[model samples]
Target chain A: TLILTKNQVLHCQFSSWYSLFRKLTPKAKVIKPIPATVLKYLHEDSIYVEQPAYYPEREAIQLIEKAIKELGGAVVPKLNWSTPKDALWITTTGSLKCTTAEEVLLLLKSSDFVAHDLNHAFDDCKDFDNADPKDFSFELVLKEWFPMHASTEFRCFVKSKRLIAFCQRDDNYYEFLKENIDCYEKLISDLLKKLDTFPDPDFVFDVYIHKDRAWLIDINPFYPRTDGLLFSWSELESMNSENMKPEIRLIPKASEGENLLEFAQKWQDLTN
Target chain B: LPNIYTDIEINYFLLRRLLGVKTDGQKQAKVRKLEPNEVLMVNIGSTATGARVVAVKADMARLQLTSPACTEINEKIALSRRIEKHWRLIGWATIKKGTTLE
Candidate 1:
């Protein structure tokens, strides 16, 4: 069934794969669980910068700071199902990376992702109604930061236990990637098959490539919880399953803002 | 199957029933108002499916099919114009993005 289930959402939680992709995972950790005061801080309004020095809670910061330094001096951060990416504007480095606990706190506080993760992580699932708030868990995940470029990121979609499509995670056009896409597809396909043990048949996974190696970024539900990138949800749903080979979509060589639909129009005209 | 985000191609032929194009027979009148964004059926014999029209320009119209021909490249389709009265073969069209019926 195309409908996602609560277990499917549970399957993609960050800690779910802590044991699964042991070797392929970037150095990362789940901070000591249950940031009660931190949770209190994230919800209570006006704490972004107000009359309190103890806002994010001293223990929460201490734990995050420890996680940051333990993973590495610098790290990328996110909660169970969301990232501080939408709140990237709040940071100095213009990224989700935080070298200190305060930075991570700011990211978590400013992000709607923070609220969405808590309230709606299970909203689209078939068993959504059964998810009582009491059974939920929140984690502050810190992955050792590296200078991974957008050009090296990709997201692959899986369906019916087969790889369906993949596209560059970064929307910008890079002439270099356009030339190397075939090699990247070959590399990504090999990794997709290697991940056969992943529980869900239909899901989406993000990966970062360095040299010829691949590393996991996040595993997302195949539904709209994830961005469609170059492929829209409707298009992804209606895709052809006539063959097992996966399809790859890359921006046709050019800058952003070009109308792609017109290209489809042109293809029809040329073929006619 | 109908996704407006992706565009596909169809090789189509207008039936000679046309009254006049540049100079010909009596052009058929609209049996019903076929407007844009309407989901319509496009079938080939026993194999039938649904699609939505995104836009129509000049003599060309774009259709987005629902999930299931599922789009059999080069497979022919019997195109019909739905009149309030009934359905009639108005043209022929076909294209593909997947496998044979097998």
Candidate 2:
């Protein structure tokens, strides 16, 4: 029987993504064993201030100061499971949206999905022990965030060491990705070769294409839990075991009278 | 069995030891560090739960709970804390005085 532990599936988090895809990912810094006091604030309700502040706690405040000095004031905040996208709503300066510690705490406390141990990791197994609480741990990572055209984002699904499917992730639909499919094929092929030692053969890679070059955004497990985007769960399941050639699928632009809002609602329903 | 922190226990500790009341924004609970082997108490919804540190890693510390009730609670705490850490980093990553951005 095949068994995977929380640690195994989350190996990517424990290690640095930049280390693996140095040239492809934005600059990043990893900080572990987050100060316990800061952890306490996250469990509390959201605190809003006109400017970003983490006063009273010296260590937590200092960490923020250091990151701003190094990565620039425009850096985005990210954790193991999420980015502080929701917190962006609270920012006044639209461009260099540097999130405050309090804003990040608010978003994390509000979302159940951010809790990696619940619903994810070891939640699927039947016989696994949930007995010991001390066996679990957590970490934090900061990525140098930058803007990219939404039209350039796509998700590529790889199974059994082969590229299975590619689909758009944003509102813009372009035939450019279709015409330049071979370029992505080669880039992903090279990427997989470098990631040959990764434990899970079934995984998804989120990428962005800019000026004919591809950049790695994020990597996720390719289990049923992962949203299939343009493809369905059943189709992905069959493709995992089948010997079909690599294929690319794109959702055609909505025709006249087609409800665009329906697509957005449906996507939210599936993901949430 | 691992010790479980129910609402009664959590409220009592907050009121008695932590010296904080939930109702008042000005009199809110202050953050405290855990002593060696002390349990980290968490309140989720109406229930209270707890976990103790079992091991420390470079990136994270392992926590052990007495029951499954607190698994989600601890996970939420951990996720929230990590996000806070990243925010702290972002705050500090801004270009500082005399430091040129390369």
Candidate 3:
């Protein structure tokens, strides 16, 4: 089943990967865990990010903010904030890695605005066997070597220049993504132009870049409670060249380990 | 259960065959006349499960059954009476939600 999450741009990365996984292995049943970090942000009655926070401009935050205001800025306006009804993608397929740039373009094109700009993306790719890759700037700026999954949902609180605090879940999704070098490099490069200015030197946001070219994905800014794929505390603390190697990471085996329906019935029998 | 009562009208033929009552046409031919709104207790079905009180309407030379009031008339069989008395004990009759009867 296709799941959808709100606001966060990083989820796009996970969706891209999952898209590939589902395409390759159509038989697998994918289930996303309920993200704990995401819950922290959501559980709050209301959150306020401080002014002068290192807010990244890469996100279409202003567009979304404008839309929310136009609708009405109530505590829980229908259009103001991401609602509980918004679905995030969840599948049982294994973590996916895009090995080709065409795949990347396809994923990006699947979105609304971007899709309009680059219509007939595959038209060129198909003709490439009869044409050339150089005709277009087919650059694989970011490569998500490893895959990660989140639970149910997550939320974000943003202001102007900085991100005051993140209330993310405590799961593998957070563990693997938090404080990685690639995450930071990508954030600064892609989003630096959009922010008021560069973030304070002392201010450290947990972001990463795949290579020097592109941002990997957005991680939840809440509690740390989502599935951690190839996540280690030390590895996330610092991203050295060795850590970036996809071969070095250990992926967890997806398994059907529990019998929830049977357990529930047995519980009923005992209670009765 | 209590006796089923409905405002829906019933067909003339069904009122005759099921209830074993004389039809309006039959009464018209007789010398004696029957009053309007006269009630009759006809043996439509059994009183064990409960009395099945169905209503119907008339079509072109046919009986059109409607207001499907299907009461289970075979589940509550009881045998009891007074001195030397035996009767097909009619259990409490009640109206229920729509049920399909074969």
- DockQ of predictions, in order shown: 0.01, 0.03, 0.01
State which candidate, 2 or 3, has the greater TM-score.
2
CAPRI category for model 3: incorrect
Q: Residue B101, candidate 2: how far off, in angstroms? A: 32
Which of the predicted structures, 1 or 2, would earn the higher TM-score when compared with the native? 1
Sort by TM-score, top down from the best: 1, 2, 3
| CAPRI quality level assigned to candidate 1 from its DockQ score | incorrect
lDDT of 1 by residue, A1-272 (tens): 36778888888888886668877768888864658888776665322332123366666778888878887699988888677777554454567778877667656665667667866787786666844644557887788888889888999998877778999888778888866787788888888777788898889989888888877788898887688899988888988655667778877765344567667787899886
**Cα TM-score per model:** 0.64, 0.58, 0.18
Candidate 3 chain A: 10-residue stretch with minimal lDDT: A83-92
- Model 2 chain B: ten consecutive residues of lowest lDDT: B88-97
| Cα lDDT, model 2, residue A240 | 47
Candidate 2 lDDT over residue span B41-80, tens digit each: 3333343333333443333344433223322222223111
A209: Cα error in model 1, Å: 1.3
Instruction: State the local distance difference test value for candidate 1.
Output: 0.68
Deviation in Å, model 3, residue A48 alpha carbon: 46
| lDDT at residue A90 of model 2 (Cα atoms) | 27
What would the per-residue lDDT of candidate 3 be over residues A10-70, giving only the tens digit for each residue?
Answer: 2222232334333221121111321233223222211112112122142333433333334
Q: How does residue A262 of candidate 2 score in lDDT?
A: 68
Model 3, first chain, TM-score of 0.22
Model 2 score (lDDT): 0.50
Please tell me which model should have the higher lDDT, number 2 or number 3. Answer: 2
